[PDB]
Amino acid sequence: STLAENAGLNPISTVTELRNRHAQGEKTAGINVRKGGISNILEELVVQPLLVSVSALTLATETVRSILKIDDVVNTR
Amino acid sequence: VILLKEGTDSSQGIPQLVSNISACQVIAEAVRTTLGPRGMDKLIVDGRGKATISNDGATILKLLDVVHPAAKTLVDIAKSQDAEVGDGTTSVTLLAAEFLKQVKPYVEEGLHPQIIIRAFRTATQLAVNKIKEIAVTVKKADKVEQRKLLEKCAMTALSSKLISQQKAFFAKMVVDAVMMLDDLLQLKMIGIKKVQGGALEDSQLVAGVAFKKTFSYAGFEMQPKKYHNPKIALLNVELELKAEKDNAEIRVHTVEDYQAIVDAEWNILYDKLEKIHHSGAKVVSSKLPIGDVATQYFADRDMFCAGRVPEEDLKRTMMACGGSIQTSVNALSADVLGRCQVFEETQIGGERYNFFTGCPKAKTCTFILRGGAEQFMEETERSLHDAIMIVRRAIKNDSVVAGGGAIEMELSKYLRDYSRTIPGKQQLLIGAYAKALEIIPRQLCDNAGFDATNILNKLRARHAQGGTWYGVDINNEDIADNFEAFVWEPAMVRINALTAASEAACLIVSVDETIKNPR
Amino acid sequence: KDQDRKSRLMGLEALKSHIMAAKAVANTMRTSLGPNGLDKMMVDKDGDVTVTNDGATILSMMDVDHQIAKLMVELSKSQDDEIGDGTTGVVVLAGALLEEAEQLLDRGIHPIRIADGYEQAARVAIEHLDKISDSVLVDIKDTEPLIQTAKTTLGSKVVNSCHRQMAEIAVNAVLTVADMERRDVDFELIKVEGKVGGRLEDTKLIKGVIVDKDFSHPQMPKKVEDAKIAILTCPFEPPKPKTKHKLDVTSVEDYKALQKYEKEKFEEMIQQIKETGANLAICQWGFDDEANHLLLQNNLPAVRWVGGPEIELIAIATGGRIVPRFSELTAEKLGFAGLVQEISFGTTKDKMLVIEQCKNSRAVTIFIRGGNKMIIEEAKRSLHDALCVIRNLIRDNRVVYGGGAAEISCALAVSQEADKCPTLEQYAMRAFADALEVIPMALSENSGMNPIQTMTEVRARQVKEMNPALGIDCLHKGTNDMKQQHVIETLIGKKQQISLATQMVRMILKIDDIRKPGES
């Protein structure tokens, strides 16, 4: 939704078209900012390794979990 | 001390025109979202506390009653539009304010108001000449029967609605209801009634006048409903036993006189009952309720009677049966009695319903609705009324143009390309006049939830390539040829809208001062 | 005119303000959902006080000046005619759909697009209810199971202590006034009355009409078995006016003369009763001691001081006519009935006129008894929904398992079908699923359980354990699977709930501006 916004597209209709494309298709569907629209990501030469998305969810969840487990902050001296 | 105004309020110049321009936009904002069939509604409340909910630009402006005088001019222009056309009040008010919005910064830059009027009078005439050029007459297109094309028009207007699946059934009856009238067509002549419960297919197409028939008094197992040539009585008299209107309170000091007083009070009902039979009225249709005793009278005399009829259905029967309304019953004669070929009580939906058929003055009909709720029938009442207007206007005028803002973009193209070849101050003004036409398709997209930017930009490209009829599709979020989709509007209606819109903007633009006599 | 001080509210803030008005009415009523619903205290304008948990009664007495709330109240007039009991289900579902819509307006979706999705999801859910439904009296008309359904309905009311007896009379009443094959039961033919004293177990069915009026004299015959009833406006005596006679007797010369004329009218009309063949003579006014003394000698019972609308109902029920004067009497204008009895109540002198037909009738009245008027009042409405429960089963014996089982099953179908709609209505379909869960999630809350844990636990049970839907055990019974608990709601009711709820959400969504002029 943020990529579609910066690419000059509708954030809702773009994300919506991808979910139907993903249920019917595969991961090839996505956003191509160079052309400004949905297209085959694998054909447009836009790819990243698996550790980026994996480490993102891992470190993000552990940080969100830590913020959730904090009940109060206490100062000392 | 010796002051010239002495409480007299008055201002003139550019601040007055800019002040009136902003007030004109406030009236458009109250009817900006009502543009289109799927437009948002407006709720209005009066001193009684009852709420009126409708997206009718004509009815909304009548209820606001704004005190600003520049707004009164726009509202008055809508009334002339109703008499001229009957619709297009939202387009005139919305489009007139758009001319004012675009010439607002030029007025502030010192451009004279009179120079602005010369552009509107010029661009309007050039637009009217282009409407008559692009307008096409459609009577026997490809030797297709007119009933076929008229159904495609009503189906498109009713598409994506509560009767979307059964739109074909409603399409046939709407065309058939219009075909049932005479040459002098009229929307007020046709009635639409609602019947709770049942499927959409069970909606009946009555040929004559009918009413809900809230009559629920005694007198059953009698009153033969069928009549071959009855005499229909149109009254507003109450024949109740102990009527709130008719009574006899005669105080006496004699037992024998009370027997006559109780009978005399009964005689008032009986004499009124006999005067109805004296003239030979087979069908008694009264506005006020009727008592159980009066039901037994005509039931024995082989005559029908049922009160609690609304005033509209009586007057709609007045034009149908060919008689007249008579509040009294003494002077009832053939001059007010009606006639029909078939009068029969029907039990559609379990409730009793009376209707006439084949009257001499049968210039009306009735549409019965069947649905699972009252709001499905209230929305369908006006949704079918739009299709009835579309079918009516196609019969009256065969010269039409593509709706959905298709002509507004061609005129925006022609006037913008014409303004380029006009040296002088009329260039920026005629171009501003062109850009103001794009508000009609822009709000049809906004009111429909679509992205007006993507459609109006894609639409402007198709018009530059040669598309003379492409416009906005309320159903699908895409550009479509409204001419091929049978979404048509008359060419004269669009002409009178621009004329009324330009005349309203010019009248506001020509104003410089507002004077107020203190009194 | 009157533009100054004109109230106005427009824009997207108005839609959120309209939603805030509907949520206030839904949050008020979601607590009174289910049999364990929390009651509501009503403070009448005249100083009276009452307590009840009925959704329709709450909306009727709720004095709301907001215009959006008044529309939600108007839906009760259309819903109670079909369902009767769960008007709360429509208001709670409507307020739930509006709350979830507020999350979609922030996303930038138009209100009409939200309404288009709910209408699409409603047809998905309404189509799902037709599949998982089950019949009771398919192809045969029977009275055994039909009585059992109403017995669970009255259990939700204060009359639960005497719920078993009133169900049988409810089936005979509807079957009497109309046939199951006709599928046309009219509430106008059905009437309900009652009086303080006794208990609710003394509820009886009177095939005909009952009016709280006594005979002309206690010495009259207490049984008119023959079917000849006269219904006059004046009594069989010297004619009198409606207010006061004011006879002028100057001296004894006028007394002996007028008494002869008066006594002649006493004998003339009292003997006219047997001329026309009428045994019972019902009259709007009372009889004099001279008249009742002659009625006794002739064995002619008569009723006194009968009310205005009471005289109308006796003519309709007995099949007679409202005779204006004795001169218009005839064989056709005499009413019909099988037995007329005077029934007192213990030590009270009510002595209501009981007109029995001694056969199957077309109109039946329901007499209620109890130790409190307000419990009798709530007892009257307890049968009104039972009439709808019976009327709904007569229109269609197909039904769906209640207790929240239907709402949870439809939410799964609406959620799966949302994947097949590639358009902005998809978010509204998912919102329709979450809004459906508020009804069962509200039942568990009103009973004192964890809502979400009880909600999702029944979801996975509806997906993993078995395909038949399972409800919530809000009454703290053994377990789920409300089919065993015999808690089953009608199919037409659930369809009208989702329909009227989607309509009420559609009407509020397409409204985007309210205008009203203030006091100048």
Short mmCIF file of C-alpha atoms in Angstrom, two decimals, chain C residues 41-416:
data_model
loop_
_atom_site.label_atom_id
_atom_site.label_comp_id
_atom_site.label_asym_id
_atom_site.label_seq_id
_atom_site.Cartn_x
_atom_site.Cartn_y
_atom_site.Cartn_z
CA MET C 41 -35.55 0.84 33.21
CA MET C 42 -38.16 3.14 31.65
CA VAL C 43 -39.18 6.42 33.30
CA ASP C 44 -42.51 7.42 31.78
CA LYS C 45 -43.35 11.08 31.26
CA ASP C 46 -46.38 10.72 33.58
CA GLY C 47 -44.33 9.21 36.44
CA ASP C 48 -44.92 5.53 35.68
CA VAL C 49 -42.10 2.97 35.84
CA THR C 50 -41.55 -0.40 34.17
CA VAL C 51 -38.77 -2.90 33.47
CA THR C 52 -38.32 -5.07 30.39
CA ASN C 53 -35.71 -6.50 28.01
CA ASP C 54 -37.84 -6.47 24.85
CA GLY C 55 -36.12 -4.95 21.83
CA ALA C 56 -39.31 -3.56 20.33
CA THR C 57 -40.53 -2.04 23.60
CA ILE C 58 -37.13 -0.41 24.15
CA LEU C 59 -37.23 1.25 20.72
CA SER C 60 -40.84 2.39 21.14
CA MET C 61 -40.20 4.18 24.45
CA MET C 62 -36.72 5.42 23.48
CA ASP C 63 -37.25 9.15 22.86
CA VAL C 64 -34.42 10.00 20.45
CA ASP C 65 -34.27 13.40 18.75
CA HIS C 66 -31.44 12.46 16.37
CA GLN C 67 -32.81 11.82 12.89
CA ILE C 68 -30.56 8.84 12.13
CA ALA C 69 -31.75 7.14 15.32
CA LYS C 70 -35.41 7.70 14.40
CA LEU C 71 -34.91 5.74 11.17
CA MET C 72 -33.47 2.83 13.16
CA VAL C 73 -36.57 3.01 15.37
CA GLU C 74 -38.87 2.97 12.33
CA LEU C 75 -37.39 -0.40 11.32
CA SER C 76 -39.05 -1.98 14.37
CA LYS C 77 -42.49 -1.30 12.87
CA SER C 78 -41.49 -3.43 9.86
CA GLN C 79 -39.50 -6.09 11.74
CA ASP C 80 -41.90 -7.00 14.55
CA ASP C 81 -44.56 -7.96 11.99
CA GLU C 82 -42.28 -10.74 10.66
CA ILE C 83 -40.03 -11.82 13.58
CA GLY C 84 -41.40 -10.16 16.72
CA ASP C 85 -38.81 -11.42 19.21
CA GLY C 86 -35.35 -10.45 17.98
CA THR C 87 -35.56 -6.86 16.83
CA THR C 88 -32.29 -6.57 18.76
CA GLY C 89 -30.59 -8.79 16.18
CA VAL C 90 -31.22 -6.23 13.44
CA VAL C 91 -30.13 -3.19 15.45
CA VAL C 92 -27.07 -4.99 16.81
CA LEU C 93 -26.12 -6.24 13.33
CA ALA C 94 -26.77 -2.80 11.81
CA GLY C 95 -24.62 -1.05 14.40
CA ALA C 96 -21.92 -3.69 13.97
CA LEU C 97 -21.78 -3.20 10.19
CA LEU C 98 -21.59 0.57 10.69
CA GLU C 99 -18.73 0.27 13.19
CA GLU C 100 -16.71 -1.90 10.81
CA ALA C 101 -17.50 0.57 8.02
CA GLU C 102 -15.70 3.30 9.99
CA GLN C 103 -12.47 1.36 9.45
CA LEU C 104 -13.17 1.37 5.70
CA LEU C 105 -13.92 5.09 5.44
CA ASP C 106 -10.43 5.79 6.80
CA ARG C 107 -9.04 3.62 3.99
CA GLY C 108 -10.68 5.97 1.47
CA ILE C 109 -13.60 3.84 0.25
CA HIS C 110 -16.86 5.50 -0.75
CA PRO C 111 -19.96 4.77 1.39
CA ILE C 112 -21.87 3.47 -1.64
CA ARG C 113 -19.11 0.94 -2.32
CA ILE C 114 -19.44 -0.28 1.28
CA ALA C 115 -23.20 -0.69 0.81
CA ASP C 116 -22.62 -2.59 -2.44
CA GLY C 117 -20.44 -5.11 -0.61
CA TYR C 118 -22.89 -5.72 2.23
CA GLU C 119 -25.68 -6.31 -0.30
CA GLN C 120 -23.42 -8.84 -2.03
CA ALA C 121 -22.46 -10.50 1.26
CA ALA C 122 -26.09 -10.58 2.39
CA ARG C 123 -27.03 -12.65 -0.66
CA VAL C 124 -24.05 -14.90 0.11
CA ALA C 125 -25.23 -15.36 3.70
CA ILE C 126 -28.93 -15.59 2.82
CA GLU C 127 -28.03 -18.27 0.26
CA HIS C 128 -26.06 -20.15 2.94
CA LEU C 129 -29.01 -20.18 5.36
CA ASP C 130 -31.20 -21.93 2.79
CA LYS C 131 -28.73 -24.84 2.63
CA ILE C 132 -28.08 -25.57 6.32
CA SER C 133 -31.75 -25.14 7.26
CA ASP C 134 -33.97 -28.01 8.41
CA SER C 135 -37.71 -28.67 8.36
CA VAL C 136 -40.09 -29.78 11.12
CA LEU C 137 -43.50 -30.41 9.51
CA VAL C 138 -42.46 -31.11 5.91
CA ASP C 139 -45.42 -32.41 3.84
CA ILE C 140 -47.65 -33.21 6.87
CA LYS C 141 -49.50 -30.86 9.23
CA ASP C 142 -48.86 -31.88 12.85
CA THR C 143 -49.18 -30.33 16.30
CA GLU C 144 -46.65 -32.32 18.37
CA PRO C 145 -43.31 -30.59 17.58
CA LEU C 146 -44.86 -27.23 16.69
CA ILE C 147 -46.01 -26.77 20.29
CA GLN C 148 -42.51 -27.52 21.58
CA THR C 149 -40.92 -24.61 19.69
CA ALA C 150 -43.18 -22.03 21.35
CA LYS C 151 -42.44 -23.49 24.79
CA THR C 152 -38.78 -22.44 24.47
CA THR C 153 -39.84 -18.96 23.30
CA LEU C 154 -41.93 -18.01 26.34
CA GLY C 155 -39.11 -19.30 28.56
CA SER C 156 -37.19 -16.11 27.75
CA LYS C 157 -39.93 -14.05 29.47
CA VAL C 158 -41.05 -13.67 33.08
CA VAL C 159 -43.88 -16.13 32.31
CA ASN C 160 -41.36 -19.01 32.06
CA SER C 161 -42.95 -20.58 35.15
CA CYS C 162 -46.11 -21.21 33.06
CA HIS C 163 -44.67 -21.56 29.55
CA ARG C 164 -45.97 -25.08 28.86
CA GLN C 165 -49.71 -24.32 28.90
CA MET C 166 -49.82 -21.18 26.74
CA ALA C 167 -48.08 -22.94 23.83
CA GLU C 168 -50.95 -25.36 23.20
CA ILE C 169 -53.51 -22.53 23.17
CA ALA C 170 -51.26 -20.59 20.78
CA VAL C 171 -51.35 -23.43 18.25
CA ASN C 172 -55.12 -23.95 18.51
CA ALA C 173 -55.66 -20.18 18.27
CA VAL C 174 -53.70 -19.72 15.03
CA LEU C 175 -55.06 -22.98 13.62
CA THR C 176 -58.59 -21.81 14.47
CA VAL C 177 -58.47 -18.29 12.99
CA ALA C 178 -56.69 -19.64 9.90
CA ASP C 179 -55.64 -22.94 8.34
CA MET C 180 -52.02 -24.02 7.98
CA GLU C 181 -52.72 -24.82 4.32
CA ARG C 182 -54.04 -21.30 3.75
CA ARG C 183 -50.77 -19.84 5.10
CA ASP C 184 -52.59 -16.58 5.94
CA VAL C 185 -52.76 -15.85 9.68
CA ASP C 186 -54.01 -12.37 10.57
CA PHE C 187 -53.09 -10.70 13.86
CA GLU C 188 -56.14 -8.42 13.61
CA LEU C 189 -58.43 -11.42 14.18
CA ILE C 190 -56.35 -12.30 17.28
CA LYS C 191 -56.88 -10.35 20.50
CA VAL C 192 -55.37 -10.63 23.98
CA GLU C 193 -56.87 -9.40 27.26
CA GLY C 194 -56.48 -10.10 30.96
CA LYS C 195 -57.16 -9.06 34.53
CA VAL C 196 -55.33 -9.02 37.85
CA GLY C 197 -55.76 -12.05 40.09
CA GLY C 198 -55.03 -15.75 39.79
CA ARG C 199 -51.98 -17.10 37.97
CA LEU C 200 -50.72 -17.41 34.41
CA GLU C 201 -51.69 -21.10 34.46
CA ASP C 202 -55.34 -19.96 34.20
CA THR C 203 -54.85 -18.70 30.63
CA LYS C 204 -57.82 -19.79 28.52
CA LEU C 205 -58.95 -19.66 24.90
CA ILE C 206 -62.38 -18.17 24.12
CA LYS C 207 -63.47 -18.78 20.52
CA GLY C 208 -65.26 -15.48 19.95
CA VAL C 209 -65.17 -12.21 21.90
CA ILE C 210 -64.80 -11.29 25.57
CA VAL C 211 -65.65 -7.87 27.04
CA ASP C 212 -65.54 -6.72 30.67
CA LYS C 213 -69.28 -6.07 30.91
CA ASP C 214 -71.97 -7.65 33.09
CA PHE C 215 -75.56 -8.68 32.48
CA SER C 216 -78.51 -6.33 32.95
CA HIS C 217 -79.40 -8.05 36.25
CA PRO C 218 -77.93 -10.89 38.35
CA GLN C 219 -81.33 -12.61 38.09
CA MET C 220 -80.90 -13.00 34.32
CA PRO C 221 -80.26 -16.47 32.85
CA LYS C 222 -76.54 -17.21 33.05
CA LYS C 223 -76.62 -19.36 29.88
CA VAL C 224 -77.84 -18.36 26.42
CA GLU C 225 -77.25 -21.57 24.46
CA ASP C 226 -79.35 -20.63 21.42
CA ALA C 227 -77.67 -18.61 18.66
CA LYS C 228 -79.94 -15.54 18.63
CA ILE C 229 -78.29 -12.31 19.82
CA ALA C 230 -79.72 -8.82 19.26
CA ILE C 231 -77.27 -5.89 19.26
CA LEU C 232 -79.13 -2.58 19.61
CA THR C 233 -77.93 0.95 20.35
CA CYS C 234 -80.78 1.67 22.81
CA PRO C 235 -82.28 -0.64 25.45
CA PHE C 236 -85.72 -2.23 25.20
CA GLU C 237 -87.38 0.41 27.37
CA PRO C 238 -88.83 3.92 26.89
CA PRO C 239 -86.32 5.63 24.56
CA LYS C 240 -83.83 7.91 26.31
CA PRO C 241 -81.06 10.21 25.00
CA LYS C 242 -77.32 9.59 25.23
CA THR C 243 -76.67 11.98 28.17
CA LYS C 244 -79.73 12.87 30.28
CA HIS C 245 -83.51 12.65 29.93
CA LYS C 246 -84.75 15.45 32.24
CA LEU C 247 -88.42 14.50 32.27
CA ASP C 248 -90.72 17.36 33.28
CA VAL C 249 -93.35 16.22 35.80
CA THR C 250 -95.27 19.23 37.12
CA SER C 251 -97.81 17.37 39.27
CA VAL C 252 -99.57 14.01 39.59
CA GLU C 253 -101.64 14.78 36.47
CA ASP C 254 -98.55 14.27 34.29
CA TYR C 255 -97.15 11.35 36.31
CA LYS C 256 -100.07 8.96 35.79
CA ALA C 257 -100.22 9.92 32.10
CA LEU C 258 -96.51 9.67 31.28
CA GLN C 259 -96.21 6.52 33.40
CA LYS C 260 -98.86 4.89 31.20
CA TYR C 261 -97.04 5.95 28.03
CA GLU C 262 -93.75 4.89 29.63
CA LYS C 263 -95.17 1.58 30.88
CA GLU C 264 -96.58 0.96 27.40
CA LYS C 265 -93.11 1.38 25.89
CA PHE C 266 -91.77 -0.97 28.57
CA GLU C 267 -94.16 -3.76 27.56
CA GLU C 268 -94.05 -3.02 23.82
CA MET C 269 -90.29 -3.31 23.33
CA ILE C 270 -89.63 -6.01 25.94
CA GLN C 271 -92.21 -8.16 24.14
CA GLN C 272 -90.70 -7.20 20.77
CA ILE C 273 -87.60 -9.22 21.74
CA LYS C 274 -89.47 -12.52 21.33
CA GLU C 275 -91.20 -11.18 18.20
CA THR C 276 -87.95 -11.07 16.20
CA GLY C 277 -86.78 -14.32 17.84
CA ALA C 278 -83.87 -12.87 19.83
CA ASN C 279 -82.97 -14.43 23.18
CA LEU C 280 -80.04 -12.17 24.16
CA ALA C 281 -80.34 -8.40 23.70
CA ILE C 282 -77.02 -6.54 23.97
CA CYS C 283 -77.46 -2.79 24.41
CA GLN C 284 -75.06 0.13 24.68
CA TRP C 285 -76.93 1.49 27.73
CA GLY C 286 -78.41 -0.02 30.87
CA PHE C 287 -81.90 -1.14 31.84
CA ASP C 288 -84.28 0.22 34.46
CA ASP C 289 -85.80 -1.75 37.34
CA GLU C 290 -89.11 -1.86 35.45
CA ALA C 291 -87.32 -3.30 32.40
CA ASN C 292 -85.32 -5.98 34.22
CA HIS C 293 -88.49 -6.93 36.12
CA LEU C 294 -90.13 -7.61 32.74
CA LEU C 295 -87.03 -9.29 31.26
CA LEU C 296 -87.03 -11.82 34.10
CA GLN C 297 -90.69 -12.73 33.56
CA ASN C 298 -89.92 -13.34 29.86
CA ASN C 299 -86.50 -15.01 30.42
CA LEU C 300 -84.67 -12.48 28.23
CA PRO C 301 -81.04 -11.87 29.29
CA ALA C 302 -79.48 -8.57 28.30
CA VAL C 303 -76.14 -6.78 28.68
CA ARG C 304 -75.75 -3.22 29.97
CA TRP C 305 -73.29 -0.36 29.45
CA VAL C 306 -71.38 -2.02 26.60
CA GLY C 307 -68.62 0.17 25.21
CA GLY C 308 -68.22 1.73 21.80
CA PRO C 309 -65.60 -0.55 20.24
CA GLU C 310 -67.01 -3.49 22.23
CA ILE C 311 -70.32 -3.29 20.36
CA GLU C 312 -68.37 -3.41 17.08
CA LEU C 313 -66.38 -6.53 17.99
CA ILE C 314 -69.46 -8.43 19.20
CA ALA C 315 -71.12 -7.87 15.82
CA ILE C 316 -68.03 -9.08 13.94
CA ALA C 317 -67.40 -12.09 16.18
CA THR C 318 -71.04 -13.22 16.40
CA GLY C 319 -71.76 -12.34 12.76
CA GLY C 320 -74.49 -9.78 13.45
CA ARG C 321 -74.95 -6.08 12.77
CA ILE C 322 -74.97 -2.93 14.91
CA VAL C 323 -78.73 -2.34 14.96
CA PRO C 324 -79.40 1.44 15.30
CA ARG C 325 -82.97 1.11 16.58
CA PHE C 326 -85.43 -1.65 17.42
CA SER C 327 -87.56 -0.86 14.35
CA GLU C 328 -84.75 -2.09 12.07
CA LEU C 329 -84.50 -5.54 13.72
CA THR C 330 -84.82 -8.63 11.55
CA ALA C 331 -83.83 -12.29 11.38
CA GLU C 332 -80.62 -11.43 9.50
CA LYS C 333 -79.37 -8.86 12.04
CA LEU C 334 -79.32 -11.38 14.92
CA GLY C 335 -75.89 -12.58 15.98
CA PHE C 336 -74.74 -16.18 16.34
CA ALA C 337 -73.01 -17.97 19.22
CA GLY C 338 -73.18 -21.31 20.98
CA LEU C 339 -73.07 -20.33 24.66
CA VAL C 340 -73.06 -17.01 26.54
CA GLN C 341 -71.80 -17.20 30.14
CA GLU C 342 -71.05 -14.67 32.88
CA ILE C 343 -67.65 -15.43 34.44
CA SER C 344 -66.67 -13.61 37.63
CA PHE C 345 -63.17 -13.53 39.18
CA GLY C 346 -63.23 -14.60 42.82
CA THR C 347 -64.51 -11.69 44.91
CA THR C 348 -64.27 -9.06 42.14
CA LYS C 349 -67.43 -7.88 40.36
CA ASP C 350 -65.99 -7.69 36.83
CA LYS C 351 -68.25 -10.40 35.35
CA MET C 352 -67.01 -10.19 31.77
CA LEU C 353 -69.39 -11.31 29.03
CA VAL C 354 -68.07 -14.60 27.61
CA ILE C 355 -69.52 -15.40 24.17
CA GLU C 356 -68.55 -18.97 23.24
CA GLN C 357 -69.09 -20.51 19.80
CA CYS C 358 -69.03 -24.21 20.82
CA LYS C 359 -67.19 -25.00 17.55
CA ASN C 360 -64.24 -23.90 15.45
CA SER C 361 -64.24 -20.13 14.88
CA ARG C 362 -62.40 -17.55 12.77
CA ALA C 363 -61.55 -15.10 15.59
CA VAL C 364 -60.25 -16.02 19.05
CA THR C 365 -59.46 -13.92 22.13
CA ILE C 366 -56.82 -14.80 24.74
CA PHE C 367 -57.64 -14.15 28.41
CA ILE C 368 -54.62 -13.83 30.73
CA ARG C 369 -54.60 -13.99 34.54
CA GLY C 370 -51.92 -13.13 37.06
CA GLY C 371 -51.00 -11.29 40.23
CA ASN C 372 -49.57 -8.15 38.60
CA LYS C 373 -50.61 -5.92 35.71
CA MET C 374 -47.10 -5.26 34.38
CA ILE C 375 -46.33 -8.99 34.35
CA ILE C 376 -49.64 -9.41 32.51
CA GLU C 377 -48.49 -6.66 30.14
CA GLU C 378 -45.19 -8.42 29.43
CA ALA C 379 -47.17 -11.66 29.20
CA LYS C 380 -49.25 -10.21 26.35
CA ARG C 381 -46.17 -9.46 24.24
CA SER C 382 -44.80 -12.92 25.11
CA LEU C 383 -47.53 -14.42 22.92
CA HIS C 384 -47.14 -11.86 20.12
CA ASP C 385 -43.73 -13.23 19.14
CA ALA C 386 -45.08 -16.74 19.74
CA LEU C 387 -47.76 -15.93 17.17
CA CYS C 388 -44.93 -14.88 14.85
CA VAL C 389 -42.97 -18.03 15.73
CA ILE C 390 -46.05 -20.07 14.82
CA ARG C 391 -46.93 -17.85 11.85
CA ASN C 392 -43.35 -18.02 10.56
CA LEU C 393 -43.29 -21.81 10.87
CA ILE C 394 -46.65 -21.95 9.06
CA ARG C 395 -45.38 -19.77 6.20
CA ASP C 396 -42.25 -21.95 6.08
CA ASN C 397 -41.49 -24.86 8.40
CA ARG C 398 -37.83 -24.65 7.34
CA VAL C 399 -35.70 -23.25 10.16
CA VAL C 400 -32.07 -22.66 11.16
CA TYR C 401 -30.32 -23.51 14.42
CA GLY C 402 -30.29 -20.45 16.68
CA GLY C 403 -28.05 -19.60 19.59
CA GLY C 404 -25.58 -17.98 17.19
CA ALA C 405 -24.99 -21.10 15.08
CA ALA C 406 -26.30 -19.50 11.89
CA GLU C 407 -24.30 -16.27 12.21
CA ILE C 408 -21.01 -18.13 12.73
CA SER C 409 -21.58 -20.43 9.75
CA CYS C 410 -22.51 -17.57 7.42
CA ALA C 411 -19.39 -15.65 8.48
CA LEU C 412 -17.24 -18.47 7.10
CA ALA C 413 -19.07 -18.49 3.76
CA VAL C 414 -18.92 -14.69 3.48
CA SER C 415 -15.20 -14.76 4.27
CA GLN C 416 -14.37 -17.37 1.63
#
